[PDB]
Amino acid sequence: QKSPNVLLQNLCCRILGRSEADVAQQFQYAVRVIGSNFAPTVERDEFLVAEKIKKELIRQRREADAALFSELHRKLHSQGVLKNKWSILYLLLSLSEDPRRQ
Amino acid sequence: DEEVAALVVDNGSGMCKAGFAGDDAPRAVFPSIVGRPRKDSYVGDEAQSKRGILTLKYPIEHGIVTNWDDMEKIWHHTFYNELRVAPEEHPVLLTEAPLNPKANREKMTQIMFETFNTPAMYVAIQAVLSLYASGRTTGIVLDSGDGVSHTVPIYEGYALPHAILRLDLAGRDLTDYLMKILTERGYSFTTTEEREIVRDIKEKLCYVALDFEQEMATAASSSSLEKSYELKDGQVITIGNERFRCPEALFQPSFLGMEACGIHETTYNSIMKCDVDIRKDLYANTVLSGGTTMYPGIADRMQKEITALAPSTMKIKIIAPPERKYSVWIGGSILASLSTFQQMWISKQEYDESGPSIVHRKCF
Amino acid sequence: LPARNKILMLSFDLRVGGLGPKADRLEELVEELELLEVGSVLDLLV
Amino acid sequence: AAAANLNAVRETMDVLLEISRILNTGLDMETLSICVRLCEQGINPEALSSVIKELRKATEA
Amino acid sequence: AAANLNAVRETMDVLLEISRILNTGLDMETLSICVRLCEQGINPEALSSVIKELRKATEA
């Protein structure tokens, strides 16, 4: 399953809680958009992403986590993620939500 | 053929089919009868031509051999007269009917290793070979020859004999009932010459429809299918209704005095004795076989009835070979062709050291 | 996997290569067709 | 309309030819004609693939 | 090889911890596919949109 396309089928089939071949009509959605863009046009720098999540985290009445995140941000830096640190974590942000609706 | 030429021999009820493997069809087709004084001994054509003042013997009448001596003589006149070959220098793969007796195979193996002393041989089911020719190792093949019939299920290739459907109806009763109906209507279809004429008419001019009611009303209202034949001898009788009732006897048996299940109903009972995981697959890759598949349009009616019979879940997908006449022969041509299949046939050394009954173990 | 799934998976690759609507045209051709033949074609990539 | 059905089946076969050219599988109209006529109700495709590949490996001689 | 299994389980656990701090909603296995995909240079803005749009489609 290492090859990129194969993964999405599995990603799609669990996100969309249905059967293996049944979801293809919607599955087709991703094939076009993901294909549209592969080689990112924004340069590499984790610090900006890190600085973003503290700010986002701080204006929401949750400020200890402005450093809890920092402590975690170095824990991963200790182990090996092959320089995809900016790409993962960034993803986790853009899918964000303050627990209160506000 | 990098190795020496191989051989195939199917001893059928109405004729024997021999040939070399890989060929288009059985290289030779001869009759299954020997001629003795009633020339002293002959085979095939000479005996039937001189059958006026001589005796004929049937080595295979209803799929079950009548005499062992006649069997060896038929094989020897196929190897020596039909093809003009030396059996001691040729490997041949022989056929079998549904669930043959073990002792018959023992006698046949002793004959093939003793009377011929060839290098190697093999003997297995016939419809399984025909399915091996239909490219689909899984399916049900309904083979009715000249003296025996069976709907053979095959799942993963090794047939399930518990679901093998045995039917004692063949072309003999076909020609007989056709002659009976023709003489009842008023024609002259009783005699031996009349028997051959009625069999030829059933082979060529007879008809096969989808149902009995529609074709019956059509023939009762007018005589479209009624076609005229004036042979070289000058005899001229044309009946549209009789040609339409000749094939229907497979679905309406009480037309010819039969108390057994219908062909489509035979396959239905066969699927009924079949397993679940293989049920739809068999209903999906079933093939047509048996020389009686020479009826045009009959396969369409069989498939229609098969679609009506089972549930809606699966379908009917029936292989209707226009090579069905030699359907058995073609089968062997495929099997013996394969190089790995070369390991399947059993040799003379093991048959001599451990007897012929080892053919039960080696020829599975 | 069913026939429709093993076509799109192939289609994605071409787009990474740079072949574009030549890969959507493929999506519409398949769609227009709507048998197991494509499955044979699939096995025969080249 | 049998001639109209003939143009329609020629159209389906033309659609399959165009796809066969896009994938670049090396099949020709008459060879595609034999292969479609075979698998229509006959052999399973995953086996026909290796059969065509073996036939093309043999003609290398 | 046992040390390799402990390395991955340690880091996936740390990544799950951040995911709950941002309150993103991804469970462990969807996070597993997501990092495995983004690991090969995927433009992560494109993936984020795809995940948002299917989560909104599955609402019926």
XYZ file of C-alpha atoms in Angstrom:
633
model
C 0.000 0.000 0.000
C 3.043 2.323 0.066
C 2.268 3.983 -3.359
C 0.274 7.283 -2.915
C -2.988 6.585 -4.749
C -3.601 3.226 -2.932
C -3.683 5.094 0.454
C -6.581 7.411 -0.459
C -8.868 4.508 -1.231
C -8.326 3.398 2.472
C -8.420 7.076 3.699
C -11.676 7.624 1.770
C -13.268 4.311 2.847
C -12.852 5.074 6.629
C -13.551 8.883 6.494
C -16.672 7.856 4.464
C -17.989 4.975 6.559
C -18.990 2.687 3.659
C -17.877 -0.358 1.559
C -14.653 -0.770 -0.538
C -15.901 -0.305 -4.162
C -19.214 1.469 -3.314
C -17.664 4.907 -2.462
C -15.938 5.410 -5.898
C -18.352 8.089 -7.149
C -17.310 10.512 -4.297
C -13.802 8.843 -4.307
C -13.455 10.364 -7.765
C -13.637 13.794 -6.029
C -10.112 13.502 -4.556
C -8.423 12.001 -7.614
C -8.769 15.270 -9.564
C -7.858 17.777 -6.797
C -4.937 15.842 -5.222
C -3.551 15.252 -8.725
C -3.982 18.961 -9.523
C -1.161 19.821 -7.015
C 1.815 17.639 -5.790
C 4.995 19.896 -5.787
C 4.310 22.548 -3.105
C 4.929 26.223 -4.052
C 5.458 27.534 -0.464
C 9.011 27.094 0.965
C 10.110 24.970 4.023
C 10.211 26.434 7.620
C 8.589 24.760 10.713
C 9.016 27.842 12.936
C 6.325 29.802 11.086
C 3.878 26.912 11.517
C 4.905 26.629 15.182
C 4.437 30.381 15.734
C 1.002 30.134 14.143
C -0.453 27.428 16.532
C 0.698 29.296 19.663
C -1.010 32.516 18.449
C -4.085 30.594 17.434
C -3.910 28.737 20.716
C -3.409 31.930 22.838
C -6.433 34.063 21.754
C -8.789 31.195 22.828
C -8.386 31.460 26.682
C -6.053 28.380 26.580
C -2.492 29.715 27.118
C -0.480 27.019 29.023
C -0.789 24.972 25.817
C 1.268 27.747 24.079
C 4.264 25.969 25.632
C 2.746 22.447 25.997
C 2.687 22.554 22.189
C 6.296 23.802 22.312
C 7.347 20.889 24.537
C 5.730 18.460 22.065
C 7.244 20.336 19.055
C 10.769 19.391 20.307
C 9.809 15.816 21.415
C 9.167 14.883 17.708
C 12.304 16.851 16.712
C 14.202 14.369 18.975
C 12.935 11.321 16.950
C 12.865 10.805 13.080
C 9.980 12.107 10.793
C 12.273 12.799 7.723
C 11.742 16.629 7.377
C 7.930 16.310 6.874
C 7.455 18.120 10.234
C 6.222 21.297 8.457
C 3.780 19.388 6.227
C 2.270 17.271 9.068
C 1.266 19.578 12.073
C 0.380 22.226 9.422
C -2.300 19.843 8.205
C -3.453 19.274 11.857
C -3.918 23.043 12.178
C -6.052 23.789 9.129
C -8.476 21.213 10.497
C -8.948 23.212 13.720
C -11.884 24.135 16.007
C -12.010 25.916 19.432
C -13.963 23.484 21.694
C -16.531 26.234 22.463
C -18.353 27.313 19.214
C -17.932 31.083 20.081
C 5.974 -32.025 -31.342
C 9.516 -32.066 -29.957
C 8.725 -35.434 -28.406
C 7.216 -38.222 -30.491
C 3.599 -37.805 -31.562
C 1.000 -38.241 -28.824
C -2.387 -39.912 -29.137
C -5.981 -39.479 -27.965
C -8.719 -42.131 -28.089
C -12.339 -41.721 -26.989
C -14.430 -44.905 -27.243
C -17.936 -43.478 -27.593
C -21.335 -45.108 -27.920
C -22.024 -44.231 -31.555
C -18.468 -43.912 -32.858
C -14.847 -43.933 -31.717
C -12.713 -40.801 -32.098
C -8.930 -41.147 -32.333
C -6.198 -38.691 -33.232
C -2.879 -37.097 -32.416
C -2.750 -34.372 -29.775
C -2.754 -30.708 -30.751
C -4.584 -31.448 -34.006
C -7.691 -29.510 -35.006
C -9.967 -32.433 -34.108
C -9.770 -36.198 -33.656
C -7.711 -37.203 -36.679
C -10.051 -40.135 -37.406
C -13.648 -41.098 -36.618
C -14.729 -44.715 -37.065
C -17.727 -46.807 -35.975
C -17.788 -48.862 -32.775
C -18.510 -52.344 -34.152
C -16.506 -55.336 -35.423
C -17.578 -57.679 -38.211
C -17.309 -61.472 -38.103
C -18.531 -64.312 -40.335
C -22.139 -65.262 -39.656
C -13.497 -61.772 -45.215
C -13.583 -63.204 -41.699
C -12.874 -60.144 -39.521
C -13.178 -56.419 -40.283
C -13.827 -53.101 -38.533
C -15.961 -50.036 -39.091
C -16.978 -49.380 -42.676
C -16.348 -52.815 -44.200
C -18.488 -54.579 -41.590
C -21.439 -52.195 -41.923
C -21.275 -52.381 -45.723
C -21.137 -56.200 -45.590
C -23.660 -56.381 -42.736
C -26.021 -58.310 -45.006
C -24.521 -61.772 -44.479
C -22.181 -61.162 -41.514
C -22.459 -60.506 -37.774
C -21.673 -57.189 -36.088
C -20.546 -56.672 -32.493
C -20.839 -53.453 -30.489
C -17.715 -52.834 -28.369
C -19.349 -49.772 -26.784
C -23.133 -49.417 -26.959
C -24.427 -47.383 -23.990
C -21.147 -46.093 -22.564
C -20.673 -49.550 -21.007
C -18.486 -51.922 -23.015
C -20.087 -55.186 -24.154
C -16.972 -57.346 -24.726
C -13.305 -56.964 -23.799
C -12.114 -58.752 -26.949
C -14.200 -56.367 -29.056
C -12.660 -53.473 -27.110
C -9.089 -54.570 -27.808
C -10.032 -55.229 -31.440
C -11.581 -51.768 -31.823
C -8.480 -50.168 -30.306
C -6.188 -52.258 -32.528
C -8.172 -51.468 -35.680
C -8.115 -47.789 -34.751
C -4.348 -47.859 -34.220
C -3.614 -50.130 -37.183
C -6.332 -49.526 -39.788
C -7.825 -46.100 -39.029
C -4.483 -44.316 -38.599
C -1.977 -47.024 -39.658
C 0.265 -46.546 -36.611
C 2.291 -48.640 -34.177
C 0.783 -48.556 -30.667
C 3.917 -49.724 -28.832
C 5.579 -46.414 -29.812
C 2.773 -43.943 -28.980
C 1.289 -42.559 -25.750
C -2.505 -42.291 -25.711
C -4.941 -40.662 -23.261
C -8.284 -42.454 -22.916
C -11.686 -41.269 -21.702
C -14.243 -42.464 -19.169
C -17.945 -42.149 -18.476
C -19.430 -40.855 -15.215
C -18.213 -42.998 -12.313
C -16.947 -46.044 -14.206
C -16.251 -49.342 -12.391
C -12.749 -49.779 -11.004
C -12.381 -53.313 -12.385
C -13.199 -52.092 -15.898
C -10.363 -49.566 -15.622
C -8.090 -52.329 -14.319
C -8.845 -54.475 -17.373
C -8.380 -51.493 -19.699
C -5.027 -50.624 -18.113
C -3.823 -54.226 -18.342
C -4.858 -54.219 -22.010
C -3.100 -50.923 -22.764
C 0.105 -51.961 -20.990
C 0.077 -55.534 -22.332
C -1.620 -55.663 -25.751
C -0.016 -52.371 -26.824
C 3.013 -52.111 -24.474
C 3.174 -48.361 -25.034
C 5.306 -45.873 -23.060
C 2.564 -44.106 -21.071
C -1.187 -43.525 -20.911
C -3.939 -41.790 -18.938
C -7.668 -42.326 -18.356
C -10.081 -39.800 -16.828
C -13.601 -38.391 -17.086
C -14.879 -37.092 -20.420
C -16.944 -34.012 -19.564
C -14.089 -32.818 -17.350
C -11.876 -32.922 -20.436
C -14.498 -31.053 -22.467
C -14.605 -28.373 -19.764
C -10.816 -28.263 -19.934
C -11.475 -27.461 -23.614
C -14.065 -24.816 -22.678
C -11.253 -22.906 -20.948
C -13.380 -22.766 -17.799
C -12.108 -25.294 -15.273
C -15.316 -24.704 -13.267
C -18.820 -25.391 -14.565
C -21.466 -27.958 -15.430
C -21.238 -29.797 -18.755
C -24.322 -31.696 -19.935
C -23.147 -34.494 -22.240
C -25.602 -36.859 -23.935
C -23.928 -39.006 -26.565
C -25.434 -42.025 -28.309
C -26.118 -44.350 -25.379
C -25.670 -42.407 -22.124
C -26.232 -38.933 -20.684
C -25.059 -36.969 -17.666
C -24.931 -33.433 -16.332
C -21.451 -33.338 -14.819
C -20.692 -30.621 -12.261
C -17.048 -29.605 -11.957
C -15.871 -27.396 -9.101
C -12.170 -26.510 -9.083
C -11.828 -29.201 -11.741
C -12.294 -32.358 -9.644
C -15.937 -33.201 -10.264
C -18.325 -33.722 -7.358
C -19.732 -37.199 -8.107
C -22.474 -36.831 -5.492
C -23.958 -34.147 -7.776
C -23.228 -35.950 -11.056
C -26.630 -36.284 -12.723
C -27.082 -39.574 -14.594
C -29.636 -39.726 -17.421
C -30.420 -42.865 -19.446
C -31.644 -40.990 -22.525
C -29.679 -40.558 -25.745
C -29.938 -40.434 -29.532
C -31.167 -44.022 -29.798
C -34.471 -43.190 -28.103
C -34.486 -39.953 -30.114
C -34.432 -41.668 -33.514
C -36.748 -44.400 -32.213
C -39.466 -42.012 -31.012
C -39.102 -39.952 -34.186
C -39.673 -43.083 -36.277
C -42.614 -44.079 -34.079
C -44.299 -40.694 -34.504
C -43.617 -40.733 -38.250
C -45.180 -44.183 -38.672
C -48.099 -43.204 -36.425
C -48.850 -40.179 -38.610
C -48.745 -42.646 -41.519
C -45.180 -42.537 -42.884
C -42.829 -45.467 -43.539
C -40.189 -45.012 -40.842
C -39.978 -48.526 -39.382
C -37.384 -50.463 -41.377
C -33.599 -50.389 -41.034
C -33.188 -48.287 -44.171
C -36.088 -46.254 -42.784
C -34.243 -46.101 -39.451
C -31.167 -44.603 -41.119
C -33.362 -42.217 -43.123
C -35.222 -41.048 -40.008
C -31.951 -40.574 -38.124
C -30.543 -38.518 -41.005
C -33.724 -36.424 -41.129
C -33.538 -35.847 -37.370
C -29.911 -34.781 -37.750
C -30.492 -32.373 -40.646
C -34.108 -31.179 -40.972
C -35.464 -31.562 -37.413
C -36.089 -28.381 -35.424
C -35.575 -27.092 -31.887
C -37.664 -24.212 -30.554
C -37.783 -22.378 -27.227
C -41.149 -23.751 -26.047
C -43.802 -26.246 -27.150
C -46.880 -24.002 -27.057
C -45.689 -21.218 -29.375
C -44.072 -23.400 -32.044
C -46.979 -25.850 -31.698
C -49.579 -23.152 -32.384
C -47.435 -21.784 -35.227
C -47.155 -25.191 -36.906
C -50.824 -25.944 -36.211
C -51.959 -22.745 -37.942
C -49.674 -23.028 -41.001
C -46.800 -25.040 -42.444
C -43.829 -22.646 -42.570
C -41.218 -24.960 -41.026
C -42.486 -27.792 -43.233
C -39.575 -28.288 -45.638
C -39.566 -30.719 -48.558
C -36.776 -33.246 -49.123
C -36.472 -35.338 -52.280
C -33.365 -37.478 -51.860
C -31.343 -39.111 -54.625
C -33.520 -42.202 -54.103
C -36.642 -40.135 -54.802
C -38.438 -40.553 -51.475
C -40.334 -37.315 -50.569
C -42.114 -36.785 -47.158
C -42.236 -33.291 -45.442
C -43.688 -32.730 -41.876
C -43.177 -29.369 -40.048
C -44.990 -30.602 -36.870
C -42.802 -33.777 -36.432
C -39.496 -31.806 -36.648
C -40.794 -29.470 -33.931
C -41.799 -32.296 -31.581
C -38.542 -34.224 -32.017
C -36.397 -31.893 -29.839
C -39.098 -30.874 -27.345
C -38.996 -34.408 -25.899
C -36.112 -33.166 -23.733
C -38.477 -30.803 -21.898
C -41.733 -32.806 -22.258
C -40.564 -36.397 -21.728
C -44.004 -38.053 -21.785
C -44.003 -37.456 -25.546
C -41.662 -40.447 -25.950
C -42.684 -42.437 -22.868
C -40.107 -41.159 -20.365
C -40.449 -40.923 -16.579
C -37.165 -39.101 -15.875
C -36.264 -35.474 -15.222
C -35.857 -32.908 -17.975
C -32.517 -31.594 -19.172
C -32.972 -28.145 -17.635
C -34.506 -29.903 -14.626
C -31.526 -32.264 -14.551
C -29.205 -29.268 -14.272
C -31.550 -27.792 -11.661
C -31.297 -30.909 -9.498
C -27.531 -30.908 -10.092
C -27.197 -27.358 -8.769
C -29.493 -28.540 -5.961
C -26.928 -31.188 -4.995
C -24.149 -28.591 -5.395
C -22.444 -26.392 -2.814
C -23.149 -22.739 -2.029
C -19.817 -20.988 -2.647
C -19.600 -22.810 -5.984
C -23.327 -22.561 -6.793
C -23.381 -19.230 -8.620
C -19.959 -19.860 -10.167
C -21.253 -23.104 -11.683
C -24.407 -21.293 -12.786
C -22.005 -18.819 -14.410
C -19.489 -20.976 -16.328
C -21.505 -23.992 -17.551
C -20.804 -25.311 -21.061
C -22.662 -27.325 -23.704
C -21.403 -30.717 -24.867
C -22.517 -34.011 -26.297
C -23.064 -34.485 -30.008
C -26.786 -33.924 -29.437
C -25.842 -30.246 -29.020
C -25.875 -30.123 -32.833
C -29.427 -28.767 -32.695
C -29.510 -25.087 -33.719
C -31.312 -22.771 -31.329
C -31.722 -25.462 -28.659
C -28.942 -23.878 -26.601
C -30.882 -20.608 -26.424
C -33.893 -22.457 -25.003
C -31.679 -24.290 -22.516
C -30.236 -20.969 -21.346
C -33.700 -19.415 -21.079
C -34.953 -22.296 -18.940
C -31.775 -22.125 -16.852
C -32.355 -18.416 -16.233
C -35.931 -19.198 -15.214
C -34.914 -22.086 -12.953
C -32.414 -20.670 -10.450
C -32.927 -17.516 -8.365
C -32.488 -13.986 -9.651
C -29.156 -13.490 -7.864
C -26.946 -15.437 -10.256
C -27.483 -15.620 -14.020
C -27.338 -18.105 -16.888
C -24.088 -17.945 -18.860
C -23.876 -21.141 -20.904
C -21.051 -21.954 -23.309
C -22.714 -23.311 -26.463
C -19.882 -24.683 -28.582
C -20.472 -24.798 -32.323
C -17.643 -27.318 -32.011
C -19.815 -29.398 -29.672
C -19.890 -32.395 -32.033
C -16.226 -33.247 -31.410
C -16.490 -31.546 -28.011
C -14.963 -34.494 -26.152
C -12.116 -34.986 -28.633
C -11.069 -31.318 -28.631
C -10.874 -31.670 -24.852
C -8.043 -34.183 -24.872
C -6.234 -32.167 -27.532
C -5.799 -29.408 -24.965
C -4.803 -31.536 -21.982
C -2.117 -33.698 -23.586
C -0.807 -30.546 -25.260
C 0.582 -29.024 -22.063
C 4.179 -29.801 -21.151
C 3.517 -29.946 -17.402
C 0.556 -32.204 -18.206
C 3.265 -34.618 -19.379
C 3.653 -35.646 -15.732
C -0.030 -36.564 -15.431
C -0.028 -39.715 -17.568
C 1.178 -42.955 -15.978
C 3.952 -45.027 -17.556
C 4.369 -48.740 -18.213
C 7.062 -49.312 -15.572
C 4.900 -48.498 -12.547
C 1.915 -50.294 -14.087
C 4.091 -53.390 -14.507
C 5.754 -53.250 -11.084
C 2.637 -52.370 -9.054
C -0.131 -53.729 -11.281
C -2.749 -51.814 -13.257
C -4.755 -50.781 -10.164
C -2.168 -48.039 -9.528
C -4.094 -46.171 -12.235
C -6.595 -45.494 -9.450
C -3.908 -43.593 -7.532
C -1.929 -41.993 -10.363
C -4.911 -41.171 -12.623
C -7.010 -39.162 -10.178
C -11.220 -4.552 -6.684
C -14.066 -3.664 -9.141
C -13.275 -2.317 -12.643
C -14.143 1.361 -12.013
C -11.735 1.632 -9.020
C -8.670 0.302 -10.971
C -9.052 2.922 -13.716
C -9.040 6.061 -11.563
C -6.039 4.728 -9.659
C -4.216 4.488 -12.985
C -5.570 7.904 -14.024
C -4.011 9.670 -11.039
C -0.504 8.633 -12.024
C -0.646 10.285 -15.468
C -1.645 13.613 -13.803
C 1.533 13.429 -11.596
C 3.465 12.673 -14.848
C 1.865 15.711 -16.557
C -0.757 14.018 -18.803
C -3.957 15.908 -17.787
C -7.442 15.880 -19.510
C -5.865 12.988 -21.591
C -6.449 11.409 -18.151
C -9.917 13.091 -17.654
C -10.944 12.131 -21.278
C -10.196 8.618 -19.921
C -12.609 9.290 -17.021
C -15.321 10.428 -19.464
C -14.685 7.606 -21.954
C -15.124 5.054 -19.163
C -18.156 6.979 -17.914
C -19.624 7.105 -21.441
C -19.242 3.306 -21.700
C -21.578 3.157 -18.681
C -17.454 -4.749 -19.648
C -14.853 -6.909 -17.878
C -12.778 -6.101 -20.958
C -11.340 -3.037 -19.187
C -10.070 -5.386 -16.476
C -8.104 -7.274 -19.124
C -6.880 -3.949 -20.569
C -5.889 -2.955 -17.034
C -3.642 -5.991 -16.638
C -2.040 -5.108 -19.967
C -0.507 -1.738 -19.017
C 1.941 -1.959 -21.975
C -31.853 -1.862 -36.942
C -29.297 -4.782 -37.029
C -27.075 -2.410 -39.180
C -27.693 0.334 -36.506
C -26.712 -2.266 -33.800
C -23.601 -3.073 -35.974
C -22.588 0.668 -35.991
C -23.337 0.812 -32.170
C -21.097 -2.270 -31.397
C -18.427 -0.784 -33.783
C -18.775 2.434 -31.657
C -18.359 0.518 -28.342
C -15.296 -1.291 -29.863
C -13.934 2.132 -31.100
C -14.312 3.498 -27.475
C -12.303 0.476 -26.169
C -9.642 0.982 -28.910
C -9.193 4.665 -27.860
C -8.774 3.607 -24.160
C -6.368 0.789 -25.238
C -4.241 3.442 -27.086
C -4.236 5.905 -24.076
C -3.003 3.115 -21.694
C -0.466 2.217 -24.477
C -1.043 -1.583 -24.240
C 0.116 -2.393 -27.853
C -3.244 -4.050 -28.893
C -4.614 -3.715 -32.529
C -8.304 -3.516 -33.668
C -8.408 -7.157 -35.001
C -6.427 -8.502 -31.956
C -8.722 -6.411 -29.663
C -11.623 -7.919 -31.733
C -10.426 -11.521 -30.931
C -9.757 -10.679 -27.220
C -13.212 -9.014 -26.667
C -14.941 -11.886 -28.581
C -13.113 -14.350 -26.239
C -13.792 -12.725 -22.809
C -17.374 -11.637 -23.687
C -18.759 -14.879 -22.088
C -15.542 -16.974 -22.073
C -12.155 -16.791 -20.276
C -11.465 -14.689 -17.123
C -9.368 -11.608 -18.095
C -6.513 -11.905 -15.516
C -5.416 -15.151 -17.295
C -5.830 -13.799 -20.868
C -3.342 -11.005 -19.902
C -0.496 -13.533 -19.189
C -1.576 -15.610 -22.244
C -1.124 -12.521 -24.552
C 2.167 -11.623 -22.765
C 3.475 -15.239 -23.251
C 2.387 -15.319 -26.941
C 4.319 -11.998 -27.406
C 7.335 -13.408 -25.478
C 7.408 -16.458 -27.865
C 7.342 -14.331 -31.109
C 10.572 -12.662 -29.825
C 12.435 -15.640 -31.441
C 13.746 -3.831 14.599
C 11.977 -3.752 18.059
C 13.601 -0.278 18.591
C 12.110 0.793 15.170
C 8.608 -0.295 16.393
C 9.072 1.720 19.648
C 10.307 4.796 17.662
C 7.126 4.862 15.500
C 4.714 4.164 18.357
C 6.425 6.908 20.475
C 6.146 9.566 17.676
C 2.605 8.661 16.476
C 1.559 8.972 20.185
C 3.166 12.476 20.406
C 1.387 13.472 17.155
C -1.939 12.226 18.516
C -1.313 14.374 21.633
C -0.948 17.597 19.559
C -4.069 16.582 17.497
C -6.213 16.702 20.687
C -4.627 20.058 21.789
C -5.691 21.655 18.462
C -9.009 19.669 18.694
C -8.820 18.497 15.035
C -10.972 15.318 15.394
C -8.690 12.820 13.571
C -8.584 9.425 15.376
C -5.310 7.350 15.500
C -5.844 5.335 12.257
C -6.919 8.331 10.071
C -3.830 10.179 11.486
C -1.765 7.083 10.490
C -2.956 7.313 6.809
C -2.595 11.129 6.829
C 1.092 11.182 7.976
C 1.887 8.178 5.721
C 0.478 10.151 2.734
C 2.027 13.581 3.619
C 5.338 11.702 4.147
C 5.893 11.623 0.303
C 5.842 15.407 -0.402
C 1.994 15.833 -0.620
C 0.836 19.525 -0.874
C -0.856 19.437 2.540
C -3.207 22.370 1.716
C -4.809 20.155 -1.019
C -5.221 17.198 1.391
C -6.755 19.409 4.187
C -9.526 20.584 1.741
C -10.230 16.961 0.603
C -10.653 15.774 4.229
C -12.915 18.811 5.046
C -15.112 18.200 1.936
C -15.646 14.442 2.564
C -16.454 15.039 6.269
C -19.157 17.422 4.980
C -20.375 14.902 2.343
C -20.634 12.000 4.931
C -23.066 14.252 6.908
C -25.943 12.475 5.000
